[PDB]
Amino acid sequence: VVIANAHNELIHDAVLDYYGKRLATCSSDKTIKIFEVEGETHKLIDTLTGHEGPVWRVDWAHPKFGTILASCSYDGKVLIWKEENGRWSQIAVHAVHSASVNSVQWAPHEYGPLLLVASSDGKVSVVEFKENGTTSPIIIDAHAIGVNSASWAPATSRKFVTGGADNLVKIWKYNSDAQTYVLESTLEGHSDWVRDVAWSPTVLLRSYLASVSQDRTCIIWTQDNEQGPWKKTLLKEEKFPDVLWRASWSLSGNVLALSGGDNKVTLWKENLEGKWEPA
Amino acid sequence: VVIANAHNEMIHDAVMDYYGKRMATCSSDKTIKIFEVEGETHKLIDTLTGHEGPVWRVDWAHPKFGTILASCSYDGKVMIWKEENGRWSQIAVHAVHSASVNSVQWAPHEYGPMLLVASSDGKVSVVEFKENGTTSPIIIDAHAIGVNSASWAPATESRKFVTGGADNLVKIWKYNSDAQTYVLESTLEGHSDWVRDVAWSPTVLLRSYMASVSQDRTCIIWTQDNEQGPWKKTLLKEEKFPDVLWRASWSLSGNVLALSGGDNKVTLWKENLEGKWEPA
Amino acid sequence: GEPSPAAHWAFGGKLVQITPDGKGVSITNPKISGLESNTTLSEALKTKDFKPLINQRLVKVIDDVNEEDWNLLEKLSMDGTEEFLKEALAFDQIETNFQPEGDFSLSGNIEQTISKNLVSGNIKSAVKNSLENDLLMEAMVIALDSNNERLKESVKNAYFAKYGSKSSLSRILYSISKREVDDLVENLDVSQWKFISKAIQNLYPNDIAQRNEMLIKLGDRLKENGHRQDSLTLYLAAGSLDKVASIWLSEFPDLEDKLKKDNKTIYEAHSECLTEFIERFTVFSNFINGINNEQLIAKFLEFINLTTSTGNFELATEFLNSLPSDNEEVKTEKARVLIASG
Amino acid sequence: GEPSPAAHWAFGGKLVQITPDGKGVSITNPKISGLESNTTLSEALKTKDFKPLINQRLVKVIDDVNEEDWNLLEKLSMDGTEEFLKEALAFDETNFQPEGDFSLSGNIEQTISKNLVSGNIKSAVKNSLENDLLMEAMVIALDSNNERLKESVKNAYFAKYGSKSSLSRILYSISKREVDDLVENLDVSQWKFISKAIQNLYPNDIAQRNEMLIKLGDRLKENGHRQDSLTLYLAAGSLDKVASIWLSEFPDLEDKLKKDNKTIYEAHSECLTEFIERFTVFSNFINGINNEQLIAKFLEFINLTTSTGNFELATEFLNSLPSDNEEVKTEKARVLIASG
């Protein structure tokens, strides 16, 4: 199934929603597009407008809140969108960062309608939408140089991993006696900017993290339990041909989808040894 | 049950039918009388006549041949008369003997319509009455001077009867198909004078009993047991009865002695456990 | 022509003789010591009250057996046949707690197969196995729960087949169960006769013929086994005058021999024995339920003769009328008496 | 702004990426070696012929026990439920002639004999029991109609024998129309018997018939008769008992698989599948959701199925779950839109 020419400017993100039927894209044209794919057909449904700069990413929210989509852009802001009564409209706007926002992600539906945001300004913001609408977020300084990604850990006590341009990967946990997310662990292992970080939703004892970097390597970080440390495990002994840009875990099977710069997508799974191989 | 003055002349015999309902008296008046006896009543029917001399004895025949009564008289004749239709008639007249006939008894019906006649003519006759009227007589001499009795012996040949002598001798006679007539058997002596009467018993018990009365004024009961066995002479008493002895009669059963004397008294006798005799 | 009483005896015990005046005739019925007209019997037989006769006979009885006899007659005359038979045939919950406890199990091919028949609802075969194996109570406890008959009895016949010869009680049970009494009548101890008797009564309450046939059978045994007095009891209850006539007709000769020794003449012996034989019989014959016996007839005819000689033509006629008018002797005799008395 | 596929995974096991031209979106369902939609199950669940499915599990079974269950199902497949429970619950002198004299010896005999003849059948038995003449007491009673008497002896036999003889104790129960005793104390080895005593005493009262059959199954399974307790359950129509047993046996089963050179996922995956196919085929022959864990694990198989893209087989199991459970609710809705 292919939807050629969804945009005329280069596209940076395409995400299907909770039912994996409703597509959504974003690119330099500074717009988002909603699609409806079936067998091998497709129908545009709208074009979201507002961002003053190329749009970097989008994330669909859990259906239990409505039909929402979040986006972030080089313009250093985040826009939420809604499809009420049959038409999309900018409900809220989040802009507390002073540089390009590169990632945005809806927390687990159990936490409510929270949003995880990371920016080149080095900070990360956590945002909920009050009873009235406005937003009173959490802002933390999380990386030097710039933050490129941030992902939520599955639900139990709330944790999320960030990936900065300081080559570091970082786990965060919420604390009461601070009313903020505090730095739980710093994981060193990349020699160049970390482009993305994905926390696997696998519900097994062991937790899985996958970080991708400008150094042409993918690292799977794992933690057996609370007393265990985060163990480093290169996805493969040899570096890759080009820069790895994204990492995505399936919802089941704990299968990793790696997006390279040689515009190639490799798939991996774990084996008896604890080493990865092509799935 | 007295029948006062039945005759004019002295009476010589009082005998009854087998059913003691009708009697028969005979006397010197040469006449016999038939009677009916009930409770104490005495109806006089006919009076038998045709006898020239005094009637001596009479005897009722067995009902088996109807009503018949035989009489014997001094006239040397015995006569029998039947009673067809309630009216007495003379059926037959037997007169073979030459002189008085003093006894006449009938034979046990078994034997038949037989009559045993004993005359003082010394002989005795046996006569049975055939059909047409003419009988076949049988006579045989039995005693010296004469004959006074002729009782019979019960049925058992084997036909026996005792005779009483005018010559003091008692005898036993048994038929004999080979002799054609009754021949002598015993000859029991015992009396010093004449044998007035002798009667034979019907008592079938183990031993035979015979009575003998005589002018010798004594009774000699002759008891014998079997063929061999001799007759045992037995004095009815070791004394003399004041007068003669005329008749001896045997009771039907219980075997008791009826001894009609001459002193005009009748005496009864029985044989106590030992074998002797006593009154009753 | 010499005077003389010219006597002669004559039928009926009558004596004839010429009167002293020699012109009349006398006819009387002489007195013979020891020879009287049986008045008590005449009365008794007329009244139907034998109390007087029973007592006269009871006062001078001969041997003991006879005494027991008249003694029997005595009681029989007071209490009456029925009340005598009632008094002569008369005789002198538990633990249930079981609670099943603990674990158990079937062991052996036997215990295991019977149960397979029970649950399999195959009660028929369960009984058979219990039997082919010596598990008797078992088969019983089982059949005692079914309402099948041909089966309910197969268990019974098995019980008899091996215990009946080993237990008297078992054997009794056999006959009852099989509704019979032959065995008890024929082999049970003659000492428990009251039990057999009673048993016969309970099996043939509506079959008086059978009952009497059995009571007489039992009767014979008692007699043949030194139980004379009891045999008379069962015979009485069975209304069998024949049997009592035989017991009595046979014990006759001896009876007349003991009287002979009592210093009695041949006539004295014969006479008393006969009269007493006849009295005892006429009496007993009154409380029973009844003349064909040949021997019996000849004695009645013997009693008749002694009777007519006492002059009692009436009593004589009574007896002649109890004999089969088909006997030309009884026939002839009737004639004689008739003519003689009427 | 650099160019990149920007790959993502989405429900149904779909992969979204950007074409090299940088202007197109491409959704697909990648082939993950090891993961395959369950056809056999989908096709057998419709054609209700698990011959193939059963033949598959049988030919690739795991431990010995597992083999019995599939065999139990392999044969249950051909013969059918009814015919199966059949082959599974079944099994592998007169006369006497009296002779000669005899006599009532003793008081006992005489008293009882008199009773009899005197038509007093009742006393005869009393006098019998009050002596060790039980055999006789029984013989007399086996002749009358009087029930209370015709029974006063049974209770007298058992009274002193039902404890010294297993067959006596069994009779005691057959007599008094009961099974409680056998069902709870008769040796488990003779179960095929306690089995017939239930079908025999309660042939027209199913609720009770099954309450007892169950009471036994529990006893078997708890005393080494696993395979058999299942047979009894299969006849009592208690899928719940069979389910519970199988849910407890689950762990150890997933462990024997994990030692067999399989990743934590291959094991977990393979296990839940075998259990679900084993439970489905079994629930298809018995007379039978309210068990939490079962539900819980039902939901689990749903997700593994949706991830295969086989939304149809997923809905089928969704239906069978109580539409009272919210998780069941939510997934019901999600699967709908995802497929519709």
How do beta strands B24-27 and B11-14 pair?
A: antiparallel
Tokens of D162: 């039902």
Residue A61 belongs to a domain: yes
Q: How many CB atoms lie within 10 A of CB D201?
A: 18
Is the CB of residue D90 less than 8 Å away from at least one CB of chain C?
Answer: no
Q: Amino acid identity of C334?
A: K
Asked if A119 and A76 touch (Cβ cutoff 8 Å), the reply is yes
Sheet of strand B24-27, all strands in order from the earlier edge strand to the far edge: B11-14, B24-27, B31-38, B41-49
Topology classification of domain D1-31 = N-terminal domain of TfIIb (2.20.25)
Measured distance CA(C235)–CA(C214) in Å, rounded = 10
Residue B248 belongs to a domain: yes
Residue among D137, D147, D146 nearest D115 (CA): D137
Residue among C321, C306, C241 nearest C272 (CA): C306
Residue D321 DSSP code: S
Between the alpha carbon of residue D134 and those of residues A46, C157, C173, D2, D142, the distances in Å are 102, 17, 13, 108, 12
Mutate to test the interface with C, among D110, D174, D181, D190 (most CBs of C within 10 A): D174
In our burial notation (b when 16+ CB lie closer than 10 A, e otherwise), range B232-243 reads eebebeeeebeb
Sign of the dihedral through C-alpha C185, C189, C193, C195 = negative
Is the CB of residue D226 less than 8 Å away from at least one CB of chain C?
Answer: no
Question: Minimal Cα–Cα distance from C275 to chain B, Å?
Answer: 14
CATH number at C109-237:
1.25.40.980
Q: Any idea of the CA torsion for C229, C230, C234, C235, to the nearest 10 degrees?
A: -20
Sign of the dihedral through C-alpha D64, D70, D72, D74 = negative
Question: Minimal Cα–Cα distance from C87 to chain D, Å?
Answer: 16
Measured distance CA(D221)–CA(D218) in Å, rounded = 5
Residue C238 DSSP code: T
Helix (H) or strand (E) holding C236: helix C228-237
Residue among A35, A40, A41, A45 nearest A15 (CA): A35
Measured distance CA(B164)–CA(B159) in Å, rounded = 17
Which parts of chain C are beta strand (E)? Answer: 8-10, 14-18, 25-28
Tokens of C312: 């009692």
Whether chains A and D touch (3+ CB pairs under 8 A) is answered by yes
Resolution value, angstrom units: 40.0
Q: Which residues contact D182 (CB under 8 A, 6 or more apart)?
A: D170, D173, D193, D194, D197
Is the CB of residue D143 less than 8 Å away from at least one CB of chain C?
Answer: yes
Q: How many CB atoms lie within 10 A of CB D73?
A: 20
Picking from D112, D119, D140, the nearest residue to C202 by CB comes out as D119
Across the interface, do A271 and D11 touch by the CB < 8 Å criterion? Answer: no
DSSP letters of B191-221? -SS---EEEE----SSSEEEEEEETTTEEB-
| CA atoms within 13 A of residue C60's CA, in its CB half-sphere | 6
Q: How many CB atoms lie within 10 A of CB D5?
A: 26
Residue among A102, A107, A68, A78 nearest A246 (CA): A102
Contacts of C310 in chain B (CB under 8 A): none
Which parts of chain D are beta strand (E)? Answer: 8-10, 14-18, 25-28
Q: Which residues contact C98 (CB under 8 A, 6 or more apart)?
A: D155, D158, D159, D162, D163, D172
Measured distance CA(A199)–CA(A243) in Å, rounded = 20
Asked if C32 and B268 touch (Cβ cutoff 8 Å), the reply is yes
Asked if A255 and D32 touch (Cβ cutoff 8 Å), the reply is yes
Tokens of B93: 């007249």
Mutate to test the interface with C, among B10, B71, B213 (most CBs of C within 10 A): B10
Asked if D198 and D212 touch (Cβ cutoff 8 Å), the reply is yes
Q: Which residues contact A89 (CB under 8 A, 6 or more apart)?
A: A81, A82
How do beta strands A87-94 and A265-270 pair?
A: unpaired
Sign of the dihedral through C-alpha C9, C11, C12, C16 = negative
Q: What's A204's domain CATH number?
A: 2.130.10.10
Measured distance CA(B278)–CA(C281) in Å, rounded = 34
Total domains in the fold of chain B: 1
Q: What is the residue whose two structure tokens read 């209490």?
A: C79
Across the interface, do C23 and B9 touch by the CB < 8 Å criterion? Answer: yes
Measured distance CA(D317)–CA(D301) in Å, rounded = 9
Q: Which residues contact D163 (CB under 8 A, 6 or more apart)?
A: C98, C101, D169
Picking from B10, B20, B250, the nearest residue to C11 by CB comes out as B20
Asked if C84 and C76 touch (Cβ cutoff 8 Å), the reply is yes
Tokens of B245: 């002895």
In our burial notation (b when 16+ CB lie closer than 10 A, e otherwise), range D289-318 reads beeeebbebbbebbebbbbbbbbebbbbbb
Tokens of A163: 């990936």
Neighbours of chain C (3+ CB pairs under 8 A): B, D
Across the interface, do B264 and C336 touch by the CB < 8 Å criterion? Answer: no
DSSP tally for chain C: helices H, then strands E: 20, 3
Is the CB of residue D213 less than 8 Å away from at least one CB of chain C?
Answer: no
Residue A1 belongs to a domain: no
Architecture, CATH, for domain D108-232: Alpha Horseshoe (1.25)
Domain of A222, in residue numbers: 9-279
Is the CB of residue D113 less than 8 Å away from at least one CB of chain C?
Answer: yes
Measured distance CA(C133)–CA(C109) in Å, rounded = 11
Q: Amino acid identity of C50?
A: F
DSSP letters of D269-308? HHHHHHHHHHHHHHHTTS-----HHHHHHHHHHHHHHHTT
Which CATH number is correct for C1-30, 3.30.450.40, 3.20.20.70, 2.20.25.400, 3.40.50.2300?
2.20.25.400
- Compute the C-alpha angle A245/A250/A254, nearest 5°: 105
Interface of D with A (CB under 8 A): 1-28, 30, 32-35, 261-265, 303-304, 307, 334, 337-338
Residue B174 DSSP code: E
What is the number of residues in chain D?
Answer: 340
* Cβ neighbourhood burial of C269 (10 Å; 0-12, 13-18, 19+): buried
Question: Minimal Cα–Cα distance from B275 to chain C, Å?
Answer: 9
Backbone angles phi, psi at C84, to 5 degrees: -75, -45
Domain ranges of chain C: 1-30, 109-237, 291-342
Across the interface, do D12 and A20 touch by the CB < 8 Å criterion? Answer: yes
Across the interface, do D104 and C169 touch by the CB < 8 Å criterion? Answer: yes
Q: Amino acid identity of A22?
A: R
Quote the crossing angle between the two packed helices D311-320 and D326-339, to the nearest 10°: 150
Tokens of A3: 């939807």
Residue D238 DSSP code: -
Tokens of D98: 């009296």
Residue A3 belongs to a domain: no
Contacts of C111 in chain D (CB under 8 A): 165-167, 170
DSSP letters of C153-217? THHHHHHHHHHTTT-HHHHHHHHHHTT--HHHHHTB-TTSHHHHHHHHHHH-TT-HHHHHHHHHH
Tokens of B48: 């038998």
Which three-class secondary structure state does DSSP give residue A25?
strand
Residue B2 belongs to a domain: no
Between the alpha carbon of residue C175 and those of residues A153, C178, C182, the distances in Å are 99, 5, 8
Residue B44 belongs to a domain: yes
Which three-class secondary structure state does DSSP give residue C120?
coil
Whether chains C and B touch (3+ CB pairs under 8 A) is answered by yes
For residue B255, the cross-strand partners are none
In our burial notation (b when 16+ CB lie closer than 10 A, e otherwise), range C209-224 reads eebbebbbbbbebbbe
Could you give the maximum distance between any two Cα atoms of chain B, in Å? 53
Quote the crossing angle between the two packed helices D51-59 and D39-47, to the nearest 10°: 140
